[PDB]
Paper text:
pmcThe translocase of the outer membrane ([name]) complex is an essential component of the outer membrane of mitochondria that acts as the main gate for protein import. The [name] core complex of [name] (NcTOM) in the mitochondrial outer membrane is a dimer with 5 subunits per protomer: Tom40, Tom22, and the small Toms (sT) Tom5, [name], and [name] (7). The protein translocation pores are formed by two copies of Tom40, each a 19-strand β-barrel with helical termini. Between the pores, two copies of the α-helical Tom22 span the membrane, with its disordered N and C-terminal domains facing the cytosol and IMS.
We then plunge-froze the mixture and performed single-particle analysis of the complex in GDN, which resulted in a 3.3 Å resolution map of the [name] core complex to which we applied C2 symmetry during the final reconstruction step. Our high-resolution [name] core map indicates two copies of the Tom40 barrel, the helical Tom22, Tom5, [name], and [name] subunits, but it lacks the receptors [name] and Tom70 and the presequence. Our map contains clear densities for the 19 individual β-strands of the Tom40 barrel and the loops connecting them. The longest loop, joining strands 14 and 15, is visible at a lower density threshold, indicating that it is flexible. At the end of β-strand 19, α3 extends into the IMS and folds back into the pore to interact with β-strand 4. Due to flexibility, α3 is only visible at a lower density threshold, while its C-terminal residues are well ordered. At the point of contact between the monomers, we see interactions between β-strands 19, 1, and 2 of the two Tom40 barrels. In the space between the protomers, we identified a phospholipid that interacts with Tom40 and Tom22. The lipid is in contact with strands 17, 18, and 19 of both Tom40s and appears to interact hydrophobically with the F309 sidechain, for which we see two rotamer conformations. We assigned these densities that each span half of the membrane to GDN detergent molecules used for solubilization.
Author numbering:
A (entry chain I), B (entry chain J): 3 to 53
C (entry chain G), D (entry chain H): 22 to 60
E (entry chain E), F (entry chain F): 9 to 46
G (entry chain C), H (entry chain D): 63 to 122
I (entry chain A), J (entry chain B): 25 to 349
Write the structure that this text describes.
Amino acid sequence: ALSEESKERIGKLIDISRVVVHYGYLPLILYLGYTRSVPRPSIIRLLSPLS
Amino acid sequence: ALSEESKERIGKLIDISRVVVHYGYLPLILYLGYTRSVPRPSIIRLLSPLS
Amino acid sequence: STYDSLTSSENASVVRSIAFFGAAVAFLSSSWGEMLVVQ
Amino acid sequence: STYDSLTSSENASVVRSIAFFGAAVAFLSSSWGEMLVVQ
Amino acid sequence: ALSREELQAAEAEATFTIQRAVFTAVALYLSPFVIDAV
Amino acid sequence: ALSREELQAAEAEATFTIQRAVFTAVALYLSPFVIDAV
Amino acid sequence: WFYHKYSTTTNFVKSTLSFAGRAAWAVSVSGLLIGVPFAIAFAEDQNYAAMEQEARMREL
Amino acid sequence: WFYHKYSTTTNFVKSTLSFAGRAAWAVSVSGLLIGVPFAIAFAEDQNYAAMEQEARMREL
Amino acid sequence: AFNAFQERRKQFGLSNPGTIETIAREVQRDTLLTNYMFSGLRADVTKAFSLAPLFQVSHQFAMGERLNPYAFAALYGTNQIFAQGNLDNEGALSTRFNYRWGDRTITKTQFSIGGGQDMAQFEHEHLGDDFSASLKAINPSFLDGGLTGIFVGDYLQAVTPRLGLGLQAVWQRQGLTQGPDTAISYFARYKAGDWVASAQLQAQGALNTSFWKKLTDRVQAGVDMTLSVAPSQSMMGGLTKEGITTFGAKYDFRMSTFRAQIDSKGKLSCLLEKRLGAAPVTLTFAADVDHVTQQAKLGMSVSIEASDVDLQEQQEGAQSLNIPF
Amino acid sequence: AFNAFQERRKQFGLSNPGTIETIAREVQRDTLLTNYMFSGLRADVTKAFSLAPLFQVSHQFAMGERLNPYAFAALYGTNQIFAQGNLDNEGALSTRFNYRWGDRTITKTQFSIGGGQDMAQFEHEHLGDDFSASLKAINPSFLDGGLTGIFVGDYLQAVTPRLGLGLQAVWQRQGLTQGPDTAISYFARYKAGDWVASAQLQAQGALNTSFWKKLTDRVQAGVDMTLSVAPSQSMMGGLTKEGITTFGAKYDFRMSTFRAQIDSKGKLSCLLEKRLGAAPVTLTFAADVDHVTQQAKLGMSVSIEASDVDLQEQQEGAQSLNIPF
Ligand SMILES: CCCCCCCCCCCC(=O)OC[C@H](COP(=O)(O)OCC[N+](C)(C)C)OC(=O)CCCCCCCCCCC
Ligand SMILES: C[C@@H]1CC[C@@]2(OC1)O[C@H]1C[C@H]3[C@@H]4CC=C5C[C@@H](OCCC(CO)CO)CC[C@]5(C)[C@H]4CC[C@]3(C)[C@H]1[C@@H]2C
Ligand SMILES: C[C@@H]1CC[C@@]2(OC1)O[C@H]1C[C@H]3[C@@H]4CC=C5C[C@@H](OCCC(CO)CO)CC[C@]5(C)[C@H]4CC[C@]3(C)[C@H]1[C@@H]2C
Ligand SMILES: C[C@@H]1CC[C@@]2(OC1)O[C@H]1C[C@H]3[C@@H]4CC=C5C[C@@H](OCCC(CO)CO)CC[C@]5(C)[C@H]4CC[C@]3(C)[C@H]1[C@@H]2C
Ligand SMILES: C[C@@H]1CC[C@@]2(OC1)O[C@H]1C[C@H]3[C@@H]4CC=C5C[C@@H](OCCC(CO)CO)CC[C@]5(C)[C@H]4CC[C@]3(C)[C@H]1[C@@H]2C
Ligand SMILES: C[C@@H]1CC[C@@]2(OC1)O[C@H]1C[C@H]3[C@@H]4CC=C5C[C@@H](OCCC(CO)CO)CC[C@]5(C)[C@H]4CC[C@]3(C)[C@H]1[C@@H]2C
Ligand SMILES: C[C@@H]1CC[C@@]2(OC1)O[C@H]1C[C@H]3[C@@H]4CC=C5C[C@@H](OCCC(CO)CO)CC[C@]5(C)[C@H]4CC[C@]3(C)[C@H]1[C@@H]2C
Ligand SMILES: C[C@@H]1CC[C@@]2(OC1)O[C@H]1C[C@H]3[C@@H]4CC=C5C[C@@H](OCCC(CO)CO)CC[C@]5(C)[C@H]4CC[C@]3(C)[C@H]1[C@@H]2C
Ligand SMILES: C[C@@H]1CC[C@@]2(OC1)O[C@H]1C[C@H]3[C@@H]4CC=C5C[C@@H](OCCC(CO)CO)CC[C@]5(C)[C@H]4CC[C@]3(C)[C@H]1[C@@H]2C
């Protein structure tokens, strides 16, 4: 079952979620890689390949 | 001085000459090369480079 | 008979494509397929 | 004074082109020019 | 748009085809047994 | 099109410039001699 | 009807000769598209194979 | 006028940051356009120079 | 009683046939150029920071008719999780995220956000001992008062150690305003010691057939053919017919890989990958000539790969790290 | 008394400055890419049948935006005669025929027939001991009741062993319906031990300047600048102004040649010629990137040269064979 009151709230929740990953996703990837890579790279190297 | 009678004759002569070289120029070049090149190539090679 | 219709404009691409595939399959699967091998 | 007119739209390309040429001539005709040589 | 009754008919076939798909899927899953029985 | 008199005027300048060109051309040809005189 | 016979042959030879021209051009480039990159790649592979084989002989 | 001030700064950073993006992209490719072909060509020249010099040593 | 079935299945020599999506991988993924051809200049700078977990970053530059001028990409992977994401020039984000439930089942996921169309795609793939199943959902939604979106169910079964049969059922509805749309496509695949043949009778009546033969360890060749039909393009009934078949070969050399291909429409293509000595750079030259129109498309690419990994330090882990790509 | 002048001239160290057309060859012909850049694929198969006389045949194929898809070319040359001809795909013939009157004076000639516009171009060039003169005529004609066509008179004089001055006078009339058009362009050239600078004040007020410096035997670099003005583009009087300057360098390696160049309009170009070992093939990679629009033009070429000449058999004569190119 669905209702107008519920539909509007869930609709924006997805919209809020859609924007959250749109921006924060890659930063989450880089966070995971930088934090738990076997050697922790000096943060300078992280976004400067082939320095 | 120039006259209409002369102009038409000389005008076509250039046109005749223009078409003569247009077709018979390269055949003259290949004739000179094939006739008096130091070694006379077998005529097959002439227009088949990198056989 | 039908052989006239076989080469119709609309059937041109299909029948041409089938033949090419037919030849390629035979070519690769035949002893001639070894021609592509260079060593 | 004239420095306003120096950067006008029409004089933009000409004055920019002259400066680039001026720098290049000095760069090649000076000890800095040796930087291009690799051996 | 489409009429109410036709919508039911369209959905009636759509489930059938999916129902047809699974029936076939089970048939393939059971197929190796019959092949061995030859 | 152009008027007859103007055509003569245009040709009058055209020869002048070519006449000017050769005069300058001769000047360069003689120029090295004066340079030696410095 | 001398002209009609003449026209047909000129159209015929022009058509086939033009067709022969396009076919020859297509073969020549298609040979260069595959011929040049392949020979460059193949030549190196032979060079490495001979070198490593030569290396084995020296090690022996 | 809180919004008006907010918009100006956001436009400024969007502009310069966008400008920084284009400038960095232009430098990076321009480095690759000249960097890659040159290093390939230059690497060969050094390789030949060392080899010919090495050949002289063997002869000597 | 399900154990009795297994004890009978083990008697046969059956083995996993792969997936429907990969039923023609040899022809359409390894040998033919369709997925690798490009135009204009291109470059990919990559850096690997580790292998267990796998962490990797890469920038891609492109130009020419390949208008998309930049794309940053990051990749993190481990035994249980694989997460990846691209971020192109216009800000559009393309992502991927696969989570492994066990030795054989992984729940992939793929989102595209920004740019043209926002899209989400889920799929739960199971690679059984003698079959492959997969249920996919594209832009699923129930907020319209009923199930909505596209749902795909794949299935591929080994019937005898050489032959594999399967079907891909589909179900989709674009809003409750209309009736659902359904279809079924049948697939087959036969593998011999040296050659593989596969066919795909798709929903629209289109038929796709392929054939792959491994001439030697370094040389492969395959041909694929596509036939399709569309409804009454003549505007007076009937059906219009068309088809295209391509033949291609791939040569593996010690320091290079060369692929050639010719369509049935007179289009000849070529692609050469060369790796420059001990350095990690790899040049890719791709050329494409259409003999009907005599026009040509050209493309050059340079791929670089730095790294801060002592290979032997982590390679032993990588060889056993089953990243769920 | 002409002998008296010569005995005076020999007292100086003057030497031939070259021709007006070559007053900036080092910058605009040897180093900069403007003449060698191209697009799309290209290939030149050539065969040399001799060297004394010089006889040579070559086919050129091209594709892509380089639409001209074919051109057959033959070349015959000797001490007194040099004849050449191109015959492109559409039948248009481009020719050349230079006849040498003596050690220093030759009479070039160049016809273009078929194609868009027929053209003829004669010129009698005299490379004096300390000057260069050249009278040229393009599409000359007297049949219109009077002299008609474009006539150019070049002249370049050495005033002091380093500096050379000269001017190029022009005269043209397109039919006796209008008055003639005339112009003059002044030229200058200075050559030091290691660098060469030249300027050209052209008819339209456009000024062209160049500078070439030889850093080492293998490395050269030069810059050129063009300024120009056009009448009242604003539609309200005044004159519009524009200019462009390019900087480029050429590197000569043992088996390669590399040239780079950047304009003032943000356009960056690069050209690499590599010769494949002992074989006569010579690849050519040309790339061009415009940073304002981020578009890129790409081109690759392969030049082959077979030969049936025992080089030392005829090279002994070719070394002294002064073909009047
Ligand atoms: C936005 C940033 C973009 C950056 C892009 C950078 C690209 C750099 C490319 C450099 C290329 C280069 O010079 O390579 C050239 C390379 C080989 O050269 P090599 O490996 O040194 O040769 C070997 C070196 N040994 C001796 C040390 C081992 O041949 C190729 O690939 C193949 C060229 C195919 C040409 C086909 C012509 C077809 C004509 C058809 C007519 C119809
Ligand atoms: C490795 C490959 C082996 C096979 C192959 O080479 C290399 O052999 C070549 C023969 C070529 C055709 C010869 C003549 C013509 C006539 C004209 O037909 C269109 C009309 C035109 C206006 O007149 C349109 O512009 C031009 C095209 C066509 C059909 C050629 C197509 C390509 C073909 C099939 C080539 C094919 C790829
Ligand atoms: C009819 C259609 C036109 C296009 C085409 O057919 C179809 O025409 C064929 C000509 C072939 C080349 C012929 C000769 C060589 C020389 C060899 O050089 C190593 C010599 C030796 C060293 O020890 C070992 O053989 C390398 C291979 C190469 C370049 C062939 C490549 C494939 C090509 C281009 C084929 C291409 C598909
Ligand atoms: C139908 C057409 C007839 C013409 C043609 O096929 C198609 O015939 C082929 C012959 C080929 C060359 C053969 C040998 C090599 C030697 C290798 O040298 C580097 C290796 C090094 C290791 O020590 C030794 O040189 C570079 C490549 C090169 C020059 C080939 C280039 C392409 C060529 C010219 C092809 C050409 C297009
Ligand atoms: C070796 C070289 C050193 C110098 C150099 O790199 C390589 O440094 C780079 C900086 C670049 C500029 C940075 C920012 C912008 C903004 C925007 O201006 C047009 C508006 C746009 C819509 O907003 C039109 O699409 C795009 C172009 C422009 C002006 C760049 C031009 C190229 C430049 C000058 C490059 C130049 C060649
Ligand atoms: C700021 C603007 C952006 C574009 C640009 O400047 C202007 O950025 C510069 C970066 C340069 C490269 C840097 C490193 C190398 C490696 C070296 O490898 C031999 C190393 C050693 C072996 O013993 C001997 O040096 C060969 C040269 C190369 C490729 C440079 C080429 C020129 C480039 C591309 C320049 C280019 C013009
Ligand atoms: C500003 C940017 C920084 C990054 C960068 O510049 C621009 O820095 C340059 C370093 C270059 C490499 C240096 C060395 C060689 C060795 C040579 O190997 C064959 C010869 C063989 C003989 O024994 C020994 O390898 C092939 C070429 C290669 C790999 C270069 C490729 C391009 C590279 C990666 C360039 C890269 C784009
Ligand atoms: C045995 C080998 C394998 C197969 C193969 O090589 C030999 O046999 C060749 C026959 C070629 C086709 C012949 C006729 C045409 C018609 C032309 O014109 C259509 C009308 C209009 C466009 O619609 C233009 O006027 C278009 C091209 C096409 C279809 C050829 C394509 C390439 C093909 C399939 C070649 C293929 C590579
Ligand atoms: C010192 C070194 C040598 C010189 C040099 O590098 C450094 O100095 C850089 C300055 C660059 C220019 C700066 C501003 C712009 C404006 C932009 O926009 C025009 C308006 C419209 C389009 O018409 C868009 O709004 C067009 C590009 C242009 C002219 C640049 C060109 C490249 C130049 C000349 C670079 C050149 C390579």
